Short mmCIF file of C-alpha atoms in Angstrom, two decimals:
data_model
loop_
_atom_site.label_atom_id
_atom_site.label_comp_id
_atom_site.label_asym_id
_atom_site.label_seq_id
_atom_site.Cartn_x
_atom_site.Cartn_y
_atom_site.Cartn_z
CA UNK A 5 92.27 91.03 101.05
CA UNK A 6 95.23 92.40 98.94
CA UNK A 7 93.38 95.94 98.73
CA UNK A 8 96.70 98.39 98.16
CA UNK A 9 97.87 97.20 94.99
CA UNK A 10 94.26 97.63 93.55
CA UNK A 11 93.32 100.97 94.81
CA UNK A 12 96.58 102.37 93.27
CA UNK A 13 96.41 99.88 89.63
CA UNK A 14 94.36 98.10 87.27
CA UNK A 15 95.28 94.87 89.98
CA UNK A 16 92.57 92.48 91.61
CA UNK A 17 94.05 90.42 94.82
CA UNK A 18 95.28 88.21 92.34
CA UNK A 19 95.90 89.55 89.17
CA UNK A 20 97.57 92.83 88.11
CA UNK A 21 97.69 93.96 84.24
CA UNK A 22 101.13 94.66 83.16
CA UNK A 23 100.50 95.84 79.36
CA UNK A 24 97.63 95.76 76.83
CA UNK A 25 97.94 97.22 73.40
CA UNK A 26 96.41 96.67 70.01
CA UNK A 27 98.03 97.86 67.26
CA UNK A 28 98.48 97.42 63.30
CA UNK A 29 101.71 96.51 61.88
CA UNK A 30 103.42 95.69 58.16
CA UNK A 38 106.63 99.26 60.58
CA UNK A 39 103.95 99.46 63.49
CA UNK A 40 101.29 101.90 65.18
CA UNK A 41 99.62 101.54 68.32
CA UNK A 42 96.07 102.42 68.21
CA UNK A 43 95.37 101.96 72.20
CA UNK A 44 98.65 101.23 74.92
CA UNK A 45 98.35 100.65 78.78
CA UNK A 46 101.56 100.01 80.55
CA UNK A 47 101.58 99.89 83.91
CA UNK A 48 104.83 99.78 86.12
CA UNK A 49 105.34 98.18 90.00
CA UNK A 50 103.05 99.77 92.52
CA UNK A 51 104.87 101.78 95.13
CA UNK A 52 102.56 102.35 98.33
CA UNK A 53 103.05 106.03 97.40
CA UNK A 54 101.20 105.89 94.32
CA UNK A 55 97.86 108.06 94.40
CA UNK A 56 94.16 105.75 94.42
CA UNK A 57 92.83 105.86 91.47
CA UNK A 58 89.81 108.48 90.55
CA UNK A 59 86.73 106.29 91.21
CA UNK A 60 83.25 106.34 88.87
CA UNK A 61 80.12 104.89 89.95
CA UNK A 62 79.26 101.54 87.76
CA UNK A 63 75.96 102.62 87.51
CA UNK A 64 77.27 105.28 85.35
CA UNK A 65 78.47 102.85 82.81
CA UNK A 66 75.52 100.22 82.13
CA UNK A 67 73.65 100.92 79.94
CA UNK A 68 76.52 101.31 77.70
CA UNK A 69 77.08 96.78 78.48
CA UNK A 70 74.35 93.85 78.02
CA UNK A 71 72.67 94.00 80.60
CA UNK A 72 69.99 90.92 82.37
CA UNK A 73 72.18 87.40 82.43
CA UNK A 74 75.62 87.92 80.80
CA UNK A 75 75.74 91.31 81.62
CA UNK A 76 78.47 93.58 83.64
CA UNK A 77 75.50 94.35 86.52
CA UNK A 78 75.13 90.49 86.99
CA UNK A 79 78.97 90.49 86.98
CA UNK A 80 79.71 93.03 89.06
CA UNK A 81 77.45 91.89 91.81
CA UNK A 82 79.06 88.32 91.77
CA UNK A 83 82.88 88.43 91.32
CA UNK A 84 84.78 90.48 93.65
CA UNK A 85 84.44 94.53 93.50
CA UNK A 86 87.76 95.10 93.39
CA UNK A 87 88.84 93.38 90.33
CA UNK A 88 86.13 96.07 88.32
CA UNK A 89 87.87 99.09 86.52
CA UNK A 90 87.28 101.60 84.09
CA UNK A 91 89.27 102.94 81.15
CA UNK A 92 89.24 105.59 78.84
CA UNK A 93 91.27 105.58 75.64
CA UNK A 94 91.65 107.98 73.07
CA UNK A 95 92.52 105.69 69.91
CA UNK A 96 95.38 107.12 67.38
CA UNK A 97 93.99 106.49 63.89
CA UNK A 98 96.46 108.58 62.38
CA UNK A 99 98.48 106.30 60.56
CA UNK A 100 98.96 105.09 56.61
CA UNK A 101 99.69 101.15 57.15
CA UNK A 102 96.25 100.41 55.99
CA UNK A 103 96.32 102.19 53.28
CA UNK A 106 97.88 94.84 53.76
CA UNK A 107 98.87 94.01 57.18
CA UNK A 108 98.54 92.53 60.51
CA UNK A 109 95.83 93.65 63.34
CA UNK A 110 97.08 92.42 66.61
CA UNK A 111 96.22 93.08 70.54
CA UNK A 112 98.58 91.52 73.17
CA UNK A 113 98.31 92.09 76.72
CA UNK A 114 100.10 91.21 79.93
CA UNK A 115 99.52 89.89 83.46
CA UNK A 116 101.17 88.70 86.46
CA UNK A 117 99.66 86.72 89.45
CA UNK A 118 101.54 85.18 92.80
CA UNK A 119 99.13 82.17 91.71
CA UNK A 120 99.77 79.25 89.19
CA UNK A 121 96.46 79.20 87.13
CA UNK A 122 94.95 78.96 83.59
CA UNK A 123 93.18 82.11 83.01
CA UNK A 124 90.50 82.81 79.99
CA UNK A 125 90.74 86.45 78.38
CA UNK A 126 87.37 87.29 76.76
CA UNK A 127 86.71 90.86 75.06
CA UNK A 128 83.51 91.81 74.06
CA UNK A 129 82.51 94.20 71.33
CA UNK A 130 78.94 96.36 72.27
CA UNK A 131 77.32 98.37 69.74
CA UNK A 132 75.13 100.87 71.80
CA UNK A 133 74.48 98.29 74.85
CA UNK A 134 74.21 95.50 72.39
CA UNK A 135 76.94 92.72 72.43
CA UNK A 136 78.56 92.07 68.70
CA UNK A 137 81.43 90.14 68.61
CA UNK A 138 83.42 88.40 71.42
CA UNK A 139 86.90 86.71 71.03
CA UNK A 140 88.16 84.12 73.96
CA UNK A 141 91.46 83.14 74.68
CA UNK A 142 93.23 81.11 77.38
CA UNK A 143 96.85 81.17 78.77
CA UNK A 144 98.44 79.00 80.78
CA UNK A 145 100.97 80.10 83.56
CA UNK A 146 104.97 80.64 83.93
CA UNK A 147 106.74 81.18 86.53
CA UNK A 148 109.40 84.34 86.07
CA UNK A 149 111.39 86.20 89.12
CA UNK A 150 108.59 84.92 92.11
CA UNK A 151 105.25 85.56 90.34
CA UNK A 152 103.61 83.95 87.51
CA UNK A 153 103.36 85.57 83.87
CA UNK A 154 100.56 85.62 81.80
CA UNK A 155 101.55 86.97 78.52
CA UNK A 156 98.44 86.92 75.24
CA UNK A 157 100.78 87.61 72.48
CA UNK A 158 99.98 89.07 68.79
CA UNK A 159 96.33 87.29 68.57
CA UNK A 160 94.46 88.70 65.76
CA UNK A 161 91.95 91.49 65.91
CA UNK A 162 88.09 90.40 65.00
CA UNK A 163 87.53 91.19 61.49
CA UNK A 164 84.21 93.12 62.64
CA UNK A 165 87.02 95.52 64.35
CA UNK A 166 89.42 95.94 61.21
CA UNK A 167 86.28 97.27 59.41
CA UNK A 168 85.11 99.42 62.16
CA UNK A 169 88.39 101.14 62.43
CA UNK A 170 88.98 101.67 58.57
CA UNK A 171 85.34 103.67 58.65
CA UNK A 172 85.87 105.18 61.82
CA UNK A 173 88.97 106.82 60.39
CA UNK A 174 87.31 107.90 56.93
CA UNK A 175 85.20 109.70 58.52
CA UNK A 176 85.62 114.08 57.63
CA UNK A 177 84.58 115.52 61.02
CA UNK A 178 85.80 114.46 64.66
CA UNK A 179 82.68 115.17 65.96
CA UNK A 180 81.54 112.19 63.97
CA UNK A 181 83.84 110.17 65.17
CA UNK A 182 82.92 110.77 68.47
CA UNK A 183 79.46 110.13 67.43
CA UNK A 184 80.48 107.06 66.49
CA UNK A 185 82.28 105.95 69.71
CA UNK A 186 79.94 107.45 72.30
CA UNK A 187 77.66 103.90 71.70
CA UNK A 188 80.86 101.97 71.56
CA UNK A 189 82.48 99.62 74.01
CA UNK A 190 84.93 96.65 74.22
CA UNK A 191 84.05 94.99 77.75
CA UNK A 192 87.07 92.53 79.01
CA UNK A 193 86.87 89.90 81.41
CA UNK A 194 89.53 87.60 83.07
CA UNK A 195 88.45 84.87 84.96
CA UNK A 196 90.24 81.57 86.69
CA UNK A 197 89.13 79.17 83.92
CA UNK A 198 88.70 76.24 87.12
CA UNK A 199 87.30 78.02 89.66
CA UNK A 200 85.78 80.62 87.37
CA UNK A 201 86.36 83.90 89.46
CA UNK A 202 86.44 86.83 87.90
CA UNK A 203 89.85 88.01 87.92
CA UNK A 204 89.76 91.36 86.20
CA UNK A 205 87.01 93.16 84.59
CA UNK A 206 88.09 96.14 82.20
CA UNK A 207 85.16 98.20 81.02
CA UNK A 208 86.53 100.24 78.05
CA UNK A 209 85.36 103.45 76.32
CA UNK A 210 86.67 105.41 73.62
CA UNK A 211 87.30 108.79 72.03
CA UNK A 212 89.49 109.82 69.27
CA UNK A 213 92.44 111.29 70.04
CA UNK A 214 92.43 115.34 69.55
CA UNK A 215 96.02 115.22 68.72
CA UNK A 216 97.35 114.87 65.41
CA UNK A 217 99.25 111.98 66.56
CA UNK A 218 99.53 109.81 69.99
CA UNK A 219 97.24 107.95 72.07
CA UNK A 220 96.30 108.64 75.75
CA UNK A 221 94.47 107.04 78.56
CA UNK A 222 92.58 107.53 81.53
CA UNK A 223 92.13 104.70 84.29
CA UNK A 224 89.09 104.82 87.17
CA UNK A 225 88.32 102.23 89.48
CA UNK A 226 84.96 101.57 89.52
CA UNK A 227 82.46 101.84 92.29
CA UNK A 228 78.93 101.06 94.37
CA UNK B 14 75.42 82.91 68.84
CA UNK B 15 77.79 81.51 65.71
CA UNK B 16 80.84 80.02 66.86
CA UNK B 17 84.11 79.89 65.17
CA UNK B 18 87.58 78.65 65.98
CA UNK B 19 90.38 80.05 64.95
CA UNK B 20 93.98 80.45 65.47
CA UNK B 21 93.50 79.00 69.34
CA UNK B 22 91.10 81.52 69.90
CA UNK B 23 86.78 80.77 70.33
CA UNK B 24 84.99 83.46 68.28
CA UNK B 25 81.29 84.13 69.39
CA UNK B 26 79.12 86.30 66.86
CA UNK B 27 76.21 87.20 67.95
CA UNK B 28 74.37 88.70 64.46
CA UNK B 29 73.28 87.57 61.48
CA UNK B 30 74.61 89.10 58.64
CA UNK B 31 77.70 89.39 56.98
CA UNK B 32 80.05 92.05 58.81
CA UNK B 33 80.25 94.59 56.46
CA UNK B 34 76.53 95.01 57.34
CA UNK B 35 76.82 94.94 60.78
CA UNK B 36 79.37 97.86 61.04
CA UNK B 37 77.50 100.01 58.62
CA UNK B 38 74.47 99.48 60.76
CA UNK B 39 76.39 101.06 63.91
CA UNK B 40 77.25 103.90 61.64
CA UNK B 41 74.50 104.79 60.17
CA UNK B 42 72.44 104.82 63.56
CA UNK B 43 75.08 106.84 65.29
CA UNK B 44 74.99 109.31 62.26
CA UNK B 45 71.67 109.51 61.16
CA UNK B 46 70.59 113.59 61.96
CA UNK B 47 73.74 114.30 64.09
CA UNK B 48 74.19 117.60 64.79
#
Protein backbone atom coordinates (compact mmCIF):
# COMPACT_ATOMS: atom_id res chain seq x y z
CA UNK A 1 0.00 0.00 0.00
CA UNK A 2 2.61 2.69 -1.02
CA UNK A 3 0.33 3.66 -4.14
CA UNK A 4 1.59 7.59 -4.68
CA UNK A 5 5.02 7.09 -5.53
CA UNK A 6 3.92 4.50 -8.26
CA UNK A 7 1.14 6.27 -9.91
CA UNK A 8 3.50 9.29 -10.45
CA UNK A 9 7.07 6.87 -11.35
CA UNK A 10 8.38 3.77 -12.64
CA UNK A 11 8.21 2.77 -8.44
CA UNK A 12 6.49 -0.49 -6.99
CA UNK A 13 5.78 -0.22 -2.98
CA UNK A 14 9.16 -1.24 -2.71
CA UNK A 15 11.29 -0.47 -5.38
CA UNK A 16 11.65 2.74 -7.44
CA UNK A 17 14.10 2.89 -10.65
CA UNK A 18 16.49 5.65 -10.37
CA UNK A 19 18.46 5.31 -13.87
CA UNK A 20 18.76 2.72 -16.68
CA UNK A 21 20.86 3.31 -19.72
CA UNK A 22 22.71 1.23 -22.24
CA UNK A 23 25.14 2.71 -24.13
CA UNK A 24 28.46 2.03 -26.27
CA UNK A 25 31.64 3.52 -25.29
CA UNK A 26 35.64 3.55 -26.51
CA UNK A 27 34.19 8.68 -25.83
CA UNK A 28 30.50 7.39 -25.15
CA UNK A 29 26.83 7.38 -26.68
CA UNK A 30 23.75 6.50 -25.08
CA UNK A 31 21.53 4.49 -27.18
CA UNK A 32 18.41 4.39 -24.56
CA UNK A 33 18.52 6.76 -20.95
CA UNK A 34 15.76 6.85 -18.17
CA UNK A 35 16.49 9.06 -15.26
CA UNK A 36 14.09 9.59 -12.97
CA UNK A 37 14.30 12.28 -10.10
CA UNK A 38 12.39 12.27 -6.33
CA UNK A 39 8.65 12.11 -6.62
CA UNK A 40 6.93 15.24 -5.41
CA UNK A 41 3.09 14.51 -4.62
CA UNK A 42 2.56 17.15 -7.34
CA UNK A 43 3.84 15.16 -10.05
CA UNK A 44 1.07 14.21 -12.75
CA UNK A 45 -0.05 9.99 -12.82
CA UNK A 46 1.34 8.57 -15.38
CA UNK A 47 -0.70 7.97 -18.89
CA UNK A 48 -2.00 4.39 -18.36
CA UNK A 49 -2.22 1.49 -21.37
CA UNK A 50 -4.14 -1.55 -21.05
CA UNK A 51 -1.66 -4.79 -20.75
CA UNK A 52 -3.73 -6.51 -22.96
CA UNK A 53 -2.50 -4.18 -25.51
CA UNK A 54 0.99 -5.37 -25.15
CA UNK A 55 0.93 -9.38 -25.17
CA UNK A 56 1.22 -10.66 -27.84
CA UNK A 57 4.28 -8.72 -28.36
CA UNK A 58 5.84 -11.20 -24.77
CA UNK A 59 5.86 -15.20 -24.36
CA UNK A 60 2.99 -15.86 -23.46
CA UNK A 61 1.46 -19.54 -21.47
CA UNK A 62 4.04 -20.28 -18.31
CA UNK A 63 6.91 -17.74 -18.28
CA UNK A 64 5.01 -15.25 -19.83
CA UNK A 65 4.12 -11.40 -18.78
CA UNK A 66 0.07 -12.53 -18.61
CA UNK A 67 1.08 -15.28 -16.03
CA UNK A 68 3.20 -12.50 -14.45
CA UNK A 69 1.06 -9.90 -14.36
CA UNK A 70 -1.73 -11.81 -12.77
CA UNK A 71 0.62 -13.02 -9.89
CA UNK A 72 3.01 -10.26 -8.66
CA UNK A 73 1.52 -7.10 -7.63
CA UNK A 74 -0.19 -4.69 -10.41
CA UNK A 75 1.48 -1.92 -9.46
CA UNK A 76 5.01 -2.82 -9.95
CA UNK A 77 3.91 -3.36 -14.09
CA UNK A 78 4.96 -0.41 -16.44
CA UNK A 79 5.41 0.40 -19.87
CA UNK A 80 8.11 2.21 -21.82
CA UNK A 81 8.72 3.55 -25.02
CA UNK A 82 12.18 4.45 -26.27
CA UNK A 83 13.31 5.85 -29.31
CA UNK A 84 17.01 4.40 -29.59
CA UNK A 85 19.86 6.97 -30.97
CA UNK A 86 21.90 4.92 -33.44
CA UNK A 87 23.52 7.84 -34.72
CA UNK A 88 26.89 7.46 -33.65
CA UNK A 89 30.53 6.30 -35.29
CA UNK A 90 32.12 4.30 -32.16
CA UNK A 91 31.38 1.12 -33.88
CA UNK A 92 32.68 1.86 -36.76
CA UNK A 93 36.15 -1.81 -31.17
CA UNK A 94 34.52 -1.04 -27.99
CA UNK A 95 32.51 -1.67 -25.01
CA UNK A 96 28.49 -2.38 -24.98
CA UNK A 97 27.28 -1.71 -21.53
CA UNK A 98 23.67 -1.20 -19.72
CA UNK A 99 23.67 -0.06 -16.03
CA UNK A 100 20.69 0.76 -14.16
CA UNK A 101 19.68 2.03 -10.75
CA UNK A 102 17.31 1.37 -7.84
CA UNK A 103 16.51 2.30 -4.44
CA UNK A 104 14.28 0.43 -1.85
CA UNK A 105 13.49 1.35 2.10
CA UNK A 106 14.18 -2.59 2.27
CA UNK A 107 17.54 -4.52 2.71
CA UNK A 108 17.25 -7.31 0.01
CA UNK A 109 19.11 -9.20 -2.79
CA UNK A 110 17.29 -8.49 -5.88
CA UNK A 111 17.74 -10.51 -9.42
CA UNK A 112 17.59 -8.19 -12.67
CA UNK A 113 16.58 -10.36 -15.66
CA UNK A 114 16.03 -8.77 -19.30
CA UNK A 115 14.61 -10.63 -21.89
CA UNK A 116 15.10 -10.26 -25.60
CA UNK A 117 11.57 -11.23 -27.82
CA UNK A 118 11.73 -11.51 -31.42
CA UNK A 119 8.02 -11.08 -32.54
CA UNK A 120 6.47 -12.72 -29.18
CA UNK A 121 9.24 -15.21 -29.16
CA UNK A 122 11.83 -15.08 -26.26
CA UNK A 123 15.71 -15.00 -27.63
CA UNK A 124 18.13 -14.22 -25.29
CA UNK A 125 17.87 -13.43 -21.52
CA UNK A 126 20.75 -12.11 -19.27
CA UNK A 127 20.34 -12.40 -15.19
CA UNK A 128 22.03 -10.53 -12.73
CA UNK A 129 21.84 -10.12 -8.94
CA UNK A 130 22.79 -7.21 -6.56
CA UNK A 131 23.07 -7.14 -3.21
CA UNK A 132 21.99 -4.08 -1.03
CA UNK A 133 23.69 -0.76 0.54
CA UNK A 134 22.55 1.35 2.65
CA UNK A 135 23.07 5.29 1.47
CA UNK A 136 21.18 8.52 3.12
CA UNK A 137 17.97 6.17 4.74
CA UNK A 138 17.17 3.86 1.78
CA UNK A 139 18.99 1.10 0.25
CA UNK A 140 20.86 1.34 -3.27
CA UNK A 141 20.82 -1.01 -5.82
CA UNK A 142 23.22 0.01 -8.42
CA UNK A 143 23.93 -2.86 -11.84
CA UNK A 144 26.96 -1.19 -13.11
CA UNK A 145 28.63 -1.46 -16.79
CA UNK A 146 27.50 -5.33 -17.33
CA UNK A 147 27.97 -6.25 -20.84
CA UNK A 148 25.35 -6.18 -23.54
CA UNK A 149 24.33 -9.86 -25.05
CA UNK A 150 26.27 -10.36 -28.09
CA UNK A 151 22.83 -11.28 -29.93
CA UNK A 152 22.16 -7.35 -29.15
CA UNK A 153 25.60 -5.89 -30.48
CA UNK A 154 24.66 -7.60 -33.80
CA UNK A 155 21.14 -6.52 -33.83
CA UNK A 156 22.05 -2.96 -33.37
CA UNK A 157 24.98 -2.86 -35.99
CA UNK A 158 22.12 -4.15 -38.71
CA UNK A 159 19.49 -2.20 -37.36
CA UNK A 160 21.57 0.88 -38.03
CA UNK A 161 22.75 -0.21 -41.69
CA UNK A 162 19.70 -0.27 -42.64
CA UNK A 163 18.82 2.80 -45.81
CA UNK A 164 15.19 3.61 -44.91
CA UNK A 165 13.63 4.43 -41.34
CA UNK A 166 10.67 2.88 -42.23
CA UNK A 167 12.70 -0.28 -42.14
CA UNK A 168 13.90 0.25 -39.13
CA UNK A 169 10.74 0.56 -37.72
CA UNK A 170 9.86 -2.55 -39.44
CA UNK A 171 12.34 -4.02 -37.71
CA UNK A 172 11.43 -2.88 -34.14
CA UNK A 173 7.64 -3.12 -34.35
CA UNK A 174 8.25 -7.24 -33.46
CA UNK A 175 10.90 -6.23 -31.01
CA UNK A 176 10.94 -6.18 -27.25
CA UNK A 177 13.33 -6.35 -24.23
CA UNK A 178 10.93 -7.46 -21.23
CA UNK A 179 12.66 -6.69 -17.60
CA UNK A 180 11.86 -8.16 -14.45
CA UNK A 181 13.02 -7.47 -10.81
CA UNK A 182 12.15 -9.73 -8.31
CA UNK A 183 13.20 -10.32 -4.35
CA UNK A 184 15.59 -13.22 -5.12
CA UNK A 185 14.18 -14.91 -1.36
CA UNK A 186 10.84 -14.29 -1.38
CA UNK A 187 10.63 -14.06 -5.16
CA UNK A 188 8.10 -11.08 -5.60
CA UNK A 189 8.10 -9.36 -8.43
CA UNK A 190 9.49 -6.10 -7.74
CA UNK A 191 9.35 -4.24 -11.02
CA UNK A 192 8.29 -5.32 -14.35
CA UNK A 193 9.43 -2.98 -17.35
CA UNK A 194 7.86 -3.94 -20.64
CA UNK A 195 9.95 -2.12 -23.30
CA UNK A 196 9.29 -1.14 -26.94
CA UNK A 197 11.20 0.64 -29.40
CA UNK A 198 11.34 3.06 -32.31
CA UNK A 199 14.15 4.84 -33.87
CA UNK A 200 14.62 8.09 -33.05
CA UNK A 201 13.34 10.70 -35.93
CA UNK A 202 15.97 13.07 -34.91
CA UNK A 203 19.26 13.21 -36.32
CA UNK A 204 20.63 12.87 -32.95
CA UNK A 205 19.15 12.24 -29.21
CA UNK A 206 17.11 9.71 -27.63
CA UNK A 207 13.63 10.15 -26.03
CA UNK A 208 11.21 8.25 -23.94
CA UNK A 209 7.81 7.74 -23.08
CA UNK A 210 6.67 6.02 -19.67
CA UNK A 211 2.85 4.41 -19.11
CA UNK A 212 1.79 2.54 -16.28
CA UNK A 213 0.17 -0.33 -17.24
CA UNK A 214 -3.34 -1.47 -16.63
CA UNK A 215 -6.49 -4.18 -16.24
CA UNK B 1 17.57 -23.35 -23.10
CA UNK B 2 21.73 -23.12 -23.28
CA UNK B 3 23.17 -21.70 -20.32
CA UNK B 4 26.26 -19.72 -20.00
CA UNK B 5 28.07 -17.88 -17.24
CA UNK B 6 29.79 -15.10 -17.64
CA UNK B 7 31.23 -12.14 -16.05
CA UNK B 8 28.72 -12.76 -12.79
CA UNK B 9 25.98 -12.72 -15.01
CA UNK B 10 23.59 -16.27 -16.04
CA UNK B 11 23.03 -16.15 -19.83
CA UNK B 12 19.90 -18.18 -21.05
CA UNK B 13 19.69 -18.77 -24.98
CA UNK B 14 16.92 -20.08 -26.04
CA UNK B 15 17.87 -21.04 -30.05
CA UNK B 16 19.90 -23.10 -31.75
CA UNK B 17 22.10 -21.63 -34.03
CA UNK B 18 24.90 -19.49 -34.02
CA UNK B 19 23.77 -15.69 -33.51
CA UNK B 20 24.58 -14.27 -36.57
CA UNK B 21 21.72 -16.54 -37.80
CA UNK B 22 19.40 -15.76 -35.37
CA UNK B 23 19.43 -11.92 -35.97
CA UNK B 24 19.30 -12.27 -39.69
CA UNK B 25 16.28 -14.44 -39.21
CA UNK B 26 14.40 -11.44 -37.33
CA UNK B 27 15.39 -9.33 -40.25
CA UNK B 28 14.59 -10.99 -42.92
CA UNK B 29 10.96 -11.86 -41.56
CA UNK B 30 10.34 -8.30 -40.60
CA UNK B 31 11.51 -7.25 -44.18
CA UNK B 32 10.41 -9.72 -46.40
CA UNK B 33 7.58 -7.64 -48.89
CA UNK B 34 7.48 -4.52 -46.63
CA UNK B 35 5.89 -1.87 -48.05
Amino acid sequence: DLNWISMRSIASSKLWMLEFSAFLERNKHLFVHISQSSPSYSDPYLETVDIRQIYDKFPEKKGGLKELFERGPSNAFFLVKFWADLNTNIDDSAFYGVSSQYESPENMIITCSTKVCSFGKQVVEKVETEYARYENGHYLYRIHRSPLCEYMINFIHKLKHLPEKYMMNSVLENFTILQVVTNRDTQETLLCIAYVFEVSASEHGAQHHIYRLVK
Amino acid sequence: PKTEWNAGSVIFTYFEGDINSMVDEHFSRALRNLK
